[PDB]
Amino acid sequence: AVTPVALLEASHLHYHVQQQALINDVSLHIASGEMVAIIGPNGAGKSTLLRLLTGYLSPSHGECHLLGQNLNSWQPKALARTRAVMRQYSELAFPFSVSEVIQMGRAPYGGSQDRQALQQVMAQTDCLALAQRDYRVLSGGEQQRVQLARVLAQLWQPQPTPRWLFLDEPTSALDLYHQQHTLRLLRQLTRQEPLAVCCVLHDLNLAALYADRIMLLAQGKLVACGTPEEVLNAETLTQWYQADLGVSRHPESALPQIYLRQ
Amino acid sequence: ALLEASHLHYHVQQQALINDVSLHIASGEMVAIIGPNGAGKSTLLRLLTGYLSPSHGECHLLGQNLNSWQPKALARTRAVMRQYSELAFPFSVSEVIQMGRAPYGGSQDRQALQQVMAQTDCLALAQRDYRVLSGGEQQRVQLARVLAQLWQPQPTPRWLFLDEPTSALDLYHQQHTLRLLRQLTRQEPLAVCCVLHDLNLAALYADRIMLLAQGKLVACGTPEEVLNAETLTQWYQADLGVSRHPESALPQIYLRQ
Amino acid sequence: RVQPRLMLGFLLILLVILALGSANMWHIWLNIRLPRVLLAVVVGCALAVSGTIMQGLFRNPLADPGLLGISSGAALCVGLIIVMLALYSHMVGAFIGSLAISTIIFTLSRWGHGNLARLLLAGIAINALCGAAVGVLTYISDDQQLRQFSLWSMGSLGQAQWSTLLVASSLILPTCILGLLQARQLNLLQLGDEEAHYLGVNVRQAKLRLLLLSAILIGAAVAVSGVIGFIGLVVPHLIRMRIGADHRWLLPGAALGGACLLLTADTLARTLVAPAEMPVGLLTSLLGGPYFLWLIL
Amino acid sequence: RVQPRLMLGFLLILLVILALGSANMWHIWLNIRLPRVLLAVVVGCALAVSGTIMQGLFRNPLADPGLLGISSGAALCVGLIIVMLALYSHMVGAFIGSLAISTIIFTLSRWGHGNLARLLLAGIAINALCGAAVGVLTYISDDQQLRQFSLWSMGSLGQAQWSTLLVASSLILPTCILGLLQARQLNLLQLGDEEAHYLGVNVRQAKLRLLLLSAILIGAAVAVSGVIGFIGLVVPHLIRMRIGADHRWLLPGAALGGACLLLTADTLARTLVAPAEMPVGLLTSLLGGPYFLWLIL
């Protein structure tokens, strides 16, 4: 018997900036149909790890495989098909319409079914009424939905195929409502299609609620890997977080809840 | 010692950004303005602080209208802390805090600065370029500036206003500042009035809480009298519910799955 | 908004009307006017397209050839080739200067946090530097070379000939086509370097090729015209306010609108006053200035 | 860092050494060289102090007199007073232009979100506008007035007399003292308008008085010297890198360092080449340019 899995594997990733190990020895794996969360305090290098798993930043000593093949040997097109990344800062200084911006996501696919993909994606991220609008004029949440739409459009295929969506740390003016909404959407997508989400959250509650596994990164090292309950306990929180945080139980769910002491 | 506000209105082009709002902040009390975006919390803060003129209403401090108050004395009585720092020139932290001693004609600036900087944990920051400081360090230095402005050798009632926190400022530093001000409220005659976006911080560190929505005050009272599931659902869009704090006897606001 | 094909057609018949009408406005007409009108068209196209590629590459609404100070660098290299195939020495010289300052401004826009400020400040510094250097030399050494060069760096097409126009257009017309093939990368690069890298875009290649592209453009345009600084600022905004910022319709639209606007500015230069050939650049600086202040406000 | 009193003393004996020393480099010494050296001192003090007040008021490390384009406005008002008590017509004219553009730049720095970019862009627009307008007129009308004015707006003290120096210094010396009395508000205004308002500072009054202050300064300095643009940028940074940004020590330190730097630049201007009086501004633009590009980088 064999249990084959679509796996993003990371073996001993190191990343130094001038002899300073920003990411020390880190090994992990994100599996298809799983919602993983990188957490940790400032300076831990979460963004650096994300950018290591995403193939953007070259590892120093370690390797980083995707579907059994090293990211080095992966070709730009196919990779662009398999893995997509959403950041929440928007750097558009020119009047692109929301449709143009999302359609820009269809880049790796030679114009094939761009209309279908855009229709579905924009339908499910709640745009459509935003389609013919200056991207710059959009409010924060609308930008959230449009960026989410861009990435989902890049990750649209007519077949059931394993793909990876990375979600960089949220911008700061973005309310709880929109973070929650996005994480819910991606959460259920994880159950439906073969999709692996890997997001970087600062909020411990959001990671507890919407992640299957959670990965506590501190000082470039992985100091915790497991369920929200295996990681988000009072001991480890006090250990790595400075705020006076404690762990209780969620009144409604069977998940840990992190609270502030008076 | 009372800061009274009677029917404050503030319009921007016929659009009532702050509709009818009446309130009072008393000496030795830690009040919290909360609410969702657009409610005009900053506008209310800037109304109570005398910076923005009311339209129809009045705003008294110690029984005297803010209009008739003189700039010096007012600068002695009330201080305001914002968390955005707009310094484009190399002022040392000491210079920046000492700048807080403005209303006091050089009198006891050394003593005040010593105490204040001691209690906000600076001192090791005193001879440093203000621009180089990290976020939390900026928090402590600004807090120090305001406390320095509010230092007097006598037991006298004073008001400290605390504008909405910058966004890169962690929970640790918000919590720390609110704790410090909280206990100051018990020791000296000081009234703190802060504007928080976080409901838990307001629950924990406020005696009274003031829910501002659409320029109107829709709730005034204890964390328990205000932060209940009904009112939260009513005015906040996130799927928030109310439970009990495992450690304290205060309401706790949580996110539903 | 407006259909792209209509805008292109309108700008094209406008170009034709403007050329014929300015020719209107026999050795003179064949060997002076025709190639000066044509030089206004080709240079206007060069600055338009270059300003558009530039604005794209730096992700800046304000990235012009003669405002980042790339033009001034090219011109100063021309001067350094005169103090010490001739048109080729001017081409290669101005291209060296252009590519050099262009590479500086590119470096500074990428590695520092994206700020229009900084770039335009480097612009001010370089422009003031060269602008000072020229007048200084006017006070140092005296000959026909330096006066003619001082009037020439002011930006003028008073010296339009067929050989210059030929070499210039032989460098410019294929580079404007090469700018058009790159319009896809130029669109995806708008999202950000990393963002575009994720979509398959070879960001390094696209960055180099674009840098190069606009360097060749400005090199030629400057070494034949001098220094003009709004035909790369204004025309792309004008076309882009009536087409999507999509570079497939943006590039060619600018190329025709640049030829239009420069030609209107040159034809108006030699005509606005009785037998007075004032440099184009006085007119572009004059018109484009308070227009640009209006944009800010 | 360095003690303020030592820095002031050093800059003062440096000023003396520079004045006397430039006096070796008979109605020449008494009625030409003495008042030209003294004019370099008084104008350098004007630009230094003005650039410092300006930088203070706009909370900008880059707010100079001839870079926001206040100088160019003053000069263009001088030109508008010549195309159509005489020194007073120049004073009042240049002060009108100065205060006008100064009031524009002040408005734009306050009401929009604080950005150095925007301000310096308005600078570029206005500078390009006036710089274009002058050369245009050089091609339009011809007489001694316009050539002398074109060379004069380049920034020069070649025309130093005792009456000009007297009026200029009678407007400048009390305004530099008035700048010194305001150094308290200038410090508190650094925190922000609201922040300062809370401390008791009448922010409106301080803003006006400062605007006015620097307007009078630049008005005089320009209407006697023309257009120089780094004696307000560089000297305050130079003094401030060796004293606290406290304005009590900042203002006077700049006032002495400006007189130092301008005088070194003027004395070097009329001497750097055999009988060639090149305008100071070519030298300031030249030296200050690539220095400023270095600051950015």
PDB file of N, CA and C in Angstrom, chain A residues 180-252:
ATOM      1  N   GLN A 180     -10.708  37.725   8.475  1.00  0.00           N
ATOM      2  CA  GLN A 180     -11.550  36.595   8.823  1.00  0.00           C
ATOM      3  C   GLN A 180     -12.193  36.027   7.572  1.00  0.00           C
ATOM      4  N   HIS A 181     -12.798  36.902   6.779  1.00  0.00           N
ATOM      5  CA  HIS A 181     -13.502  36.481   5.574  1.00  0.00           C
ATOM      6  C   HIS A 181     -12.581  35.741   4.599  1.00  0.00           C
ATOM      7  N   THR A 182     -11.414  36.327   4.333  1.00  0.00           N
ATOM      8  CA  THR A 182     -10.444  35.700   3.441  1.00  0.00           C
ATOM      9  C   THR A 182     -10.006  34.334   3.958  1.00  0.00           C
ATOM     10  N   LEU A 183      -9.664  34.278   5.241  1.00  0.00           N
ATOM     11  CA  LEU A 183      -9.218  33.021   5.834  1.00  0.00           C
ATOM     12  C   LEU A 183     -10.303  31.944   5.818  1.00  0.00           C
ATOM     13  N   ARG A 184     -11.566  32.346   5.948  1.00  0.00           N
ATOM     14  CA  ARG A 184     -12.685  31.413   5.853  1.00  0.00           C
ATOM     15  C   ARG A 184     -12.787  30.846   4.445  1.00  0.00           C
ATOM     16  N   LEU A 185     -12.764  31.747   3.471  1.00  0.00           N
ATOM     17  CA  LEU A 185     -12.841  31.367   2.066  1.00  0.00           C
ATOM     18  C   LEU A 185     -11.751  30.345   1.720  1.00  0.00           C
ATOM     19  N   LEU A 186     -10.502  30.704   2.000  1.00  0.00           N
ATOM     20  CA  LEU A 186      -9.382  29.809   1.735  1.00  0.00           C
ATOM     21  C   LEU A 186      -9.535  28.498   2.516  1.00  0.00           C
ATOM     22  N   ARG A 187     -10.018  28.605   3.751  1.00  0.00           N
ATOM     23  CA  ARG A 187     -10.252  27.440   4.604  1.00  0.00           C
ATOM     24  C   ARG A 187     -11.123  26.409   3.915  1.00  0.00           C
ATOM     25  N   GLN A 188     -12.288  26.829   3.413  1.00  0.00           N
ATOM     26  CA  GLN A 188     -13.195  25.879   2.757  1.00  0.00           C
ATOM     27  C   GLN A 188     -12.694  25.429   1.382  1.00  0.00           C
ATOM     28  N   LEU A 189     -11.987  26.314   0.682  1.00  0.00           N
ATOM     29  CA  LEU A 189     -11.352  25.918  -0.572  1.00  0.00           C
ATOM     30  C   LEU A 189     -10.423  24.737  -0.329  1.00  0.00           C
ATOM     31  N   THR A 190      -9.743  24.757   0.809  1.00  0.00           N
ATOM     32  CA  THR A 190      -8.875  23.661   1.208  1.00  0.00           C
ATOM     33  C   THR A 190      -9.612  22.318   1.279  1.00  0.00           C
ATOM     34  N   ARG A 191     -10.891  22.355   1.645  1.00  0.00           N
ATOM     35  CA  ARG A 191     -11.693  21.136   1.757  1.00  0.00           C
ATOM     36  C   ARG A 191     -12.222  20.685   0.396  1.00  0.00           C
ATOM     37  N   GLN A 192     -12.653  21.647  -0.420  1.00  0.00           N
ATOM     38  CA  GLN A 192     -13.161  21.342  -1.760  1.00  0.00           C
ATOM     39  C   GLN A 192     -12.088  20.865  -2.739  1.00  0.00           C
ATOM     40  N   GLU A 193     -11.370  21.801  -3.350  1.00  0.00           N
ATOM     41  CA  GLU A 193     -10.336  21.462  -4.327  1.00  0.00           C
ATOM     42  C   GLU A 193      -9.020  21.090  -3.661  1.00  0.00           C
ATOM     43  N   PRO A 194      -8.091  20.488  -4.414  1.00  0.00           N
ATOM     44  CA  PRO A 194      -6.767  20.196  -3.862  1.00  0.00           C
ATOM     45  C   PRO A 194      -5.875  21.434  -3.776  1.00  0.00           C
ATOM     46  N   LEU A 195      -6.022  22.203  -2.700  1.00  0.00           N
ATOM     47  CA  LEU A 195      -5.303  23.458  -2.537  1.00  0.00           C
ATOM     48  C   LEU A 195      -4.629  23.476  -1.189  1.00  0.00           C
ATOM     49  N   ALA A 196      -3.377  23.927  -1.159  1.00  0.00           N
ATOM     50  CA  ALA A 196      -2.655  24.100   0.101  1.00  0.00           C
ATOM     51  C   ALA A 196      -2.417  25.567   0.353  1.00  0.00           C
ATOM     52  N   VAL A 197      -2.975  26.082   1.438  1.00  0.00           N
ATOM     53  CA  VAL A 197      -2.780  27.471   1.821  1.00  0.00           C
ATOM     54  C   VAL A 197      -1.687  27.572   2.874  1.00  0.00           C
ATOM     55  N   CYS A 198      -0.814  28.572   2.746  1.00  0.00           N
ATOM     56  CA  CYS A 198       0.233  28.835   3.734  1.00  0.00           C
ATOM     57  C   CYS A 198       0.278  30.319   4.049  1.00  0.00           C
ATOM     58  N   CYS A 199      -0.351  30.725   5.139  1.00  0.00           N
ATOM     59  CA  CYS A 199      -0.481  32.142   5.424  1.00  0.00           C
ATOM     60  C   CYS A 199       0.408  32.543   6.593  1.00  0.00           C
ATOM     61  N   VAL A 200       0.760  33.828   6.682  1.00  0.00           N
ATOM     62  CA  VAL A 200       1.591  34.345   7.773  1.00  0.00           C
ATOM     63  C   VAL A 200       0.785  35.327   8.608  1.00  0.00           C
ATOM     64  N   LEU A 201       0.266  34.881   9.747  1.00  0.00           N
ATOM     65  CA  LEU A 201      -0.565  35.746  10.587  1.00  0.00           C
ATOM     66  C   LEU A 201       0.129  36.206  11.869  1.00  0.00           C
ATOM     67  N   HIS A 202      -0.164  37.438  12.274  1.00  0.00           N
ATOM     68  CA  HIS A 202       0.346  37.983  13.522  1.00  0.00           C
ATOM     69  C   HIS A 202      -0.646  37.672  14.629  1.00  0.00           C
ATOM     70  N   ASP A 203      -1.909  37.494  14.255  1.00  0.00           N
ATOM     71  CA  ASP A 203      -2.975  37.273  15.224  1.00  0.00           C
ATOM     72  C   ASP A 203      -3.071  35.796  15.566  1.00  0.00           C
ATOM     73  N   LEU A 204      -2.911  35.463  16.841  1.00  0.00           N
ATOM     74  CA  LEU A 204      -2.887  34.066  17.271  1.00  0.00           C
ATOM     75  C   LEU A 204      -4.255  33.399  17.198  1.00  0.00           C
ATOM     76  N   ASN A 205      -5.308  34.160  17.475  1.00  0.00           N
ATOM     77  CA  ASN A 205      -6.664  33.634  17.393  1.00  0.00           C
ATOM     78  C   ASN A 205      -7.056  33.199  15.980  1.00  0.00           C
ATOM     79  N   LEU A 206      -6.698  34.004  14.985  1.00  0.00           N
ATOM     80  CA  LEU A 206      -7.006  33.676  13.599  1.00  0.00           C
ATOM     81  C   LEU A 206      -6.275  32.412  13.172  1.00  0.00           C
ATOM     82  N   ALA A 207      -5.053  32.253  13.645  1.00  0.00           N
ATOM     83  CA  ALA A 207      -4.294  31.069  13.325  1.00  0.00           C
ATOM     84  C   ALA A 207      -4.898  29.854  14.018  1.00  0.00           C
ATOM     85  N   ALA A 208      -5.374  30.028  15.253  1.00  0.00           N
ATOM     86  CA  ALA A 208      -6.012  28.938  16.014  1.00  0.00           C
ATOM     87  C   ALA A 208      -7.270  28.454  15.324  1.00  0.00           C
ATOM     88  N   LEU A 209      -8.123  29.406  14.969  1.00  0.00           N
ATOM     89  CA  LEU A 209      -9.393  29.118  14.315  1.00  0.00           C
ATOM     90  C   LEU A 209      -9.247  28.511  12.913  1.00  0.00           C
ATOM     91  N   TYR A 210      -8.457  29.155  12.052  1.00  0.00           N
ATOM     92  CA  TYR A 210      -8.433  28.807  10.634  1.00  0.00           C
ATOM     93  C   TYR A 210      -7.202  28.046  10.132  1.00  0.00           C
ATOM     94  N   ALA A 211      -6.402  27.482  11.030  1.00  0.00           N
ATOM     95  CA  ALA A 211      -5.278  26.662  10.596  1.00  0.00           C
ATOM     96  C   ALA A 211      -5.353  25.239  11.111  1.00  0.00           C
ATOM     97  N   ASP A 212      -4.920  24.307  10.273  1.00  0.00           N
ATOM     98  CA  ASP A 212      -4.881  22.899  10.632  1.00  0.00           C
ATOM     99  C   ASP A 212      -3.604  22.640  11.398  1.00  0.00           C
ATOM    100  N   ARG A 213      -2.509  23.161  10.881  1.00  0.00           N
ATOM    101  CA  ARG A 213      -1.244  23.116  11.587  1.00  0.00           C
ATOM    102  C   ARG A 213      -0.727  24.537  11.745  1.00  0.00           C
ATOM    103  N   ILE A 214       0.129  24.736  12.735  1.00  0.00           N
ATOM    104  CA  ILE A 214       0.617  26.056  13.067  1.00  0.00           C
ATOM    105  C   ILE A 214       2.118  25.937  13.304  1.00  0.00           C
ATOM    106  N   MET A 215       2.870  26.944  12.888  1.00  0.00           N
ATOM    107  CA  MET A 215       4.323  26.833  12.903  1.00  0.00           C
ATOM    108  C   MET A 215       4.951  28.062  13.536  1.00  0.00           C
ATOM    109  N   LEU A 216       5.370  27.914  14.791  1.00  0.00           N
ATOM    110  CA  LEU A 216       5.894  29.013  15.584  1.00  0.00           C
ATOM    111  C   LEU A 216       7.368  29.244  15.288  1.00  0.00           C
ATOM    112  N   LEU A 217       7.646  30.356  14.619  1.00  0.00           N
ATOM    113  CA  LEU A 217       8.993  30.694  14.201  1.00  0.00           C
ATOM    114  C   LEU A 217       9.534  31.730  15.163  1.00  0.00           C
ATOM    115  N   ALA A 218      10.702  31.448  15.731  1.00  0.00           N
ATOM    116  CA  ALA A 218      11.358  32.381  16.628  1.00  0.00           C
ATOM    117  C   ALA A 218      12.870  32.344  16.414  1.00  0.00           C
ATOM    118  N   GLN A 219      13.462  33.528  16.250  1.00  0.00           N
ATOM    119  CA  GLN A 219      14.898  33.686  16.015  1.00  0.00           C
ATOM    120  C   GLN A 219      15.432  32.783  14.914  1.00  0.00           C
ATOM    121  N   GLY A 220      14.722  32.757  13.786  1.00  0.00           N
ATOM    122  CA  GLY A 220      15.116  31.964  12.633  1.00  0.00           C
ATOM    123  C   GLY A 220      15.020  30.458  12.813  1.00  0.00           C
ATOM    124  N   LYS A 221      14.481  30.021  13.945  1.00  0.00           N
ATOM    125  CA  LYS A 221      14.332  28.596  14.194  1.00  0.00           C
ATOM    126  C   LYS A 221      12.869  28.239  14.372  1.00  0.00           C
ATOM    127  N   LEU A 222      12.514  27.008  14.015  1.00  0.00           N
ATOM    128  CA  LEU A 222      11.172  26.508  14.259  1.00  0.00           C
ATOM    129  C   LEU A 222      11.119  25.937  15.662  1.00  0.00           C
ATOM    130  N   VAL A 223      10.299  26.533  16.521  1.00  0.00           N
ATOM    131  CA  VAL A 223      10.252  26.107  17.912  1.00  0.00           C
ATOM    132  C   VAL A 223       8.957  25.387  18.275  1.00  0.00           C
ATOM    133  N   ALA A 224       8.088  25.179  17.290  1.00  0.00           N
ATOM    134  CA  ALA A 224       6.810  24.501  17.489  1.00  0.00           C
ATOM    135  C   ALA A 224       6.144  24.160  16.149  1.00  0.00           C
ATOM    136  N   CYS A 225       5.674  22.924  16.004  1.00  0.00           N
ATOM    137  CA  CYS A 225       4.985  22.463  14.798  1.00  0.00           C
ATOM    138  C   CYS A 225       3.844  21.558  15.212  1.00  0.00           C
ATOM    139  N   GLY A 226       2.606  21.946  14.923  1.00  0.00           N
ATOM    140  CA  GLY A 226       1.480  21.072  15.214  1.00  0.00           C
ATOM    141  C   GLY A 226       0.125  21.744  15.217  1.00  0.00           C
ATOM    142  N   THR A 227      -0.861  21.067  15.786  1.00  0.00           N
ATOM    143  CA  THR A 227      -2.216  21.586  15.860  1.00  0.00           C
ATOM    144  C   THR A 227      -2.235  22.866  16.660  1.00  0.00           C
ATOM    145  N   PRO A 228      -3.275  23.685  16.487  1.00  0.00           N
ATOM    146  CA  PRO A 228      -3.483  24.851  17.343  1.00  0.00           C
ATOM    147  C   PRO A 228      -3.413  24.528  18.837  1.00  0.00           C
ATOM    148  N   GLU A 229      -3.828  23.329  19.223  1.00  0.00           N
ATOM    149  CA  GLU A 229      -3.797  22.943  20.629  1.00  0.00           C
ATOM    150  C   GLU A 229      -2.415  22.451  21.053  1.00  0.00           C
ATOM    151  N   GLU A 230      -1.682  21.844  20.125  1.00  0.00           N
ATOM    152  CA  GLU A 230      -0.348  21.350  20.435  1.00  0.00           C
ATOM    153  C   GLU A 230       0.660  22.484  20.546  1.00  0.00           C
ATOM    154  N   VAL A 231       0.304  23.653  20.020  1.00  0.00           N
ATOM    155  CA  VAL A 231       1.224  24.787  20.010  1.00  0.00           C
ATOM    156  C   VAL A 231       0.760  25.968  20.853  1.00  0.00           C
ATOM    157  N   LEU A 232      -0.471  26.422  20.649  1.00  0.00           N
ATOM    158  CA  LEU A 232      -0.963  27.603  21.356  1.00  0.00           C
ATOM    159  C   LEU A 232      -1.401  27.330  22.801  1.00  0.00           C
ATOM    160  N   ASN A 233      -0.460  26.882  23.623  1.00  0.00           N
ATOM    161  CA  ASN A 233      -0.683  26.744  25.057  1.00  0.00           C
ATOM    162  C   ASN A 233       0.038  27.844  25.839  1.00  0.00           C
ATOM    163  N   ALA A 234      -0.441  28.135  27.047  1.00  0.00           N
ATOM    164  CA  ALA A 234       0.060  29.256  27.855  1.00  0.00           C
ATOM    165  C   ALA A 234       1.573  29.268  28.066  1.00  0.00           C
ATOM    166  N   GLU A 235       2.152  28.080  28.208  1.00  0.00           N
ATOM    167  CA  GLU A 235       3.581  27.914  28.446  1.00  0.00           C
ATOM    168  C   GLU A 235       4.443  28.452  27.308  1.00  0.00           C
ATOM    169  N   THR A 236       4.135  28.006  26.089  1.00  0.00           N
ATOM    170  CA  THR A 236       4.859  28.417  24.880  1.00  0.00           C
ATOM    171  C   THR A 236       4.610  29.887  24.510  1.00  0.00           C
ATOM    172  N   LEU A 237       3.387  30.347  24.741  1.00  0.00           N
ATOM    173  CA  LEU A 237       3.042  31.743  24.517  1.00  0.00           C
ATOM    174  C   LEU A 237       3.814  32.683  25.430  1.00  0.00           C
ATOM    175  N   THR A 238       3.814  32.401  26.733  1.00  0.00           N
ATOM    176  CA  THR A 238       4.633  33.171  27.673  1.00  0.00           C
ATOM    177  C   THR A 238       6.092  33.113  27.255  1.00  0.00           C
ATOM    178  N   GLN A 239       6.553  31.911  26.923  1.00  0.00           N
ATOM    179  CA  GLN A 239       7.930  31.710  26.488  1.00  0.00           C
ATOM    180  C   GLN A 239       8.379  32.611  25.324  1.00  0.00           C
ATOM    181  N   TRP A 240       7.573  32.721  24.263  1.00  0.00           N
ATOM    182  CA  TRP A 240       8.014  33.458  23.069  1.00  0.00           C
ATOM    183  C   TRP A 240       7.323  34.797  22.788  1.00  0.00           C
ATOM    184  N   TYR A 241       6.233  35.094  23.485  1.00  0.00           N
ATOM    185  CA  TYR A 241       5.536  36.370  23.298  1.00  0.00           C
ATOM    186  C   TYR A 241       5.617  37.250  24.552  1.00  0.00           C
ATOM    187  N   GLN A 242       5.752  38.554  24.354  1.00  0.00           N
ATOM    188  CA  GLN A 242       6.010  39.452  25.472  1.00  0.00           C
ATOM    189  C   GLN A 242       4.743  39.960  26.145  1.00  0.00           C
ATOM    190  N   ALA A 243       3.644  40.016  25.402  1.00  0.00           N
ATOM    191  CA  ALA A 243       2.389  40.494  25.965  1.00  0.00           C
ATOM    192  C   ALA A 243       1.915  39.530  27.049  1.00  0.00           C
ATOM    193  N   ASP A 244       1.097  40.019  27.977  1.00  0.00           N
ATOM    194  CA  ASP A 244       0.640  39.177  29.078  1.00  0.00           C
ATOM    195  C   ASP A 244      -0.519  38.297  28.627  1.00  0.00           C
ATOM    196  N   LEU A 245      -0.202  37.337  27.763  1.00  0.00           N
ATOM    197  CA  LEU A 245      -1.202  36.481  27.142  1.00  0.00           C
ATOM    198  C   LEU A 245      -1.372  35.173  27.895  1.00  0.00           C
ATOM    199  N   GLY A 246      -2.616  34.724  28.001  1.00  0.00           N
ATOM    200  CA  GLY A 246      -2.912  33.433  28.595  1.00  0.00           C
ATOM    201  C   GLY A 246      -3.796  32.593  27.688  1.00  0.00           C
ATOM    202  N   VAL A 247      -3.906  31.304  27.984  1.00  0.00           N
ATOM    203  CA  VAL A 247      -4.726  30.418  27.169  1.00  0.00           C
ATOM    204  C   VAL A 247      -5.949  29.877  27.913  1.00  0.00           C
ATOM    205  N   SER A 248      -7.115  30.077  27.310  1.00  0.00           N
ATOM    206  CA  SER A 248      -8.377  29.570  27.814  1.00  0.00           C
ATOM    207  C   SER A 248      -9.007  28.725  26.725  1.00  0.00           C
ATOM    208  N   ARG A 249     -10.254  28.320  26.935  1.00  0.00           N
ATOM    209  CA  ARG A 249     -10.993  27.562  25.933  1.00  0.00           C
ATOM    210  C   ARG A 249     -12.030  28.423  25.222  1.00  0.00           C
ATOM    211  N   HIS A 250     -12.202  28.174  23.930  1.00  0.00           N
ATOM    212  CA  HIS A 250     -13.197  28.877  23.134  1.00  0.00           C
ATOM    213  C   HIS A 250     -14.583  28.465  23.586  1.00  0.00           C
ATOM    214  N   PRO A 251     -15.432  29.436  23.946  1.00  0.00           N
ATOM    215  CA  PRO A 251     -16.815  29.125  24.325  1.00  0.00           C
ATOM    216  C   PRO A 251     -17.616  28.371  23.254  1.00  0.00           C
ATOM    217  N   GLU A 252     -17.317  28.595  21.979  1.00  0.00           N
ATOM    218  CA  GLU A 252     -18.129  28.003  20.920  1.00  0.00           C
ATOM    219  C   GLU A 252     -17.451  26.862  20.171  1.00  0.00           C
TER     220      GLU A 252
END
